[PDB]
């Protein structure tokens, strides 16, 4: 003070974020500026990155392969860990590309 922002027994609500799909996983960046929200149902916009300082939401992925199960932030670097159904993909966000892909050998992560 993509996804739209909107600004009760002590209901001190600050900023409601509405997304097209039911979000399944939530993750926080170390600096508290980025929120990662993932939904497995959607595809094109399965995961959304929300910048609180800019008060905006965006989809950092042009084309997503596989349904996204969960997401988290790297604890030493801005890399985003995307746990899809079968793979785990490492994405570098500052340069917007794919670093590594982990072959879990798992039918469902």
């Amino acid at each position: 003070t993509s996804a739209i922002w909107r600004r009760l027994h002590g209901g001190i609500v600050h900023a409601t974020v509405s997304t097209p799909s039911s979000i399944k996983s939530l993750s926080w960046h170390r600096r508290g500026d980025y929120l990662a929200t993932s939904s497995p149902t959607s595809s094109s916009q399965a995961v959304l990155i929300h910048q609180l300082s800019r008060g905006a939401s965006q989809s950092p992925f042009s084309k997503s392969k596989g349904s996204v199960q969960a997401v988290t932030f790297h604890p030493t670097m801005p890399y985003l860990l995307v746990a899809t159904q079968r793979y785990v993909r490492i994405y570098n966000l500052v340069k917007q590309e794919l670093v590594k892909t982990l072959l879990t050998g798992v039918k469902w992560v």
Binding site: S21, S22, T41, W108
Partner: protein
Amino acid sequence: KILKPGKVALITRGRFAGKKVVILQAIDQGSKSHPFGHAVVAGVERYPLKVTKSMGAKRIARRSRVKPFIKVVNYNHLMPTRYALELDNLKGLITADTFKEPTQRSAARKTVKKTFEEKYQSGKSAWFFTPLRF
């Protein structure tokens, strides 16, 4: 209204093509996750083998085992069929919550497996348990 919970149908698209399924519950209105007229079905992935007067109870039971599957299928990919299969054990056990919950998906699959065991052993829906030759 030819697709109702308890109607036998055929799948023509996907991995389980040519398999006979029973409509567990119809979502003709559609859903946010499936924006079409889909319906959850339970089918027979591996049909039981034919049995004879001979062979011991061990071999007959070994050949009578059935492997089921559960799947959300589009109406356009389902082929409706006049035969109907109903049992109270398979009413309302499946839902969207079951598909999201994988342990419930496996539990429902095992329940469908068992239910097909008593049904096959009792000799009901012999056509449904007979594989279709195409």
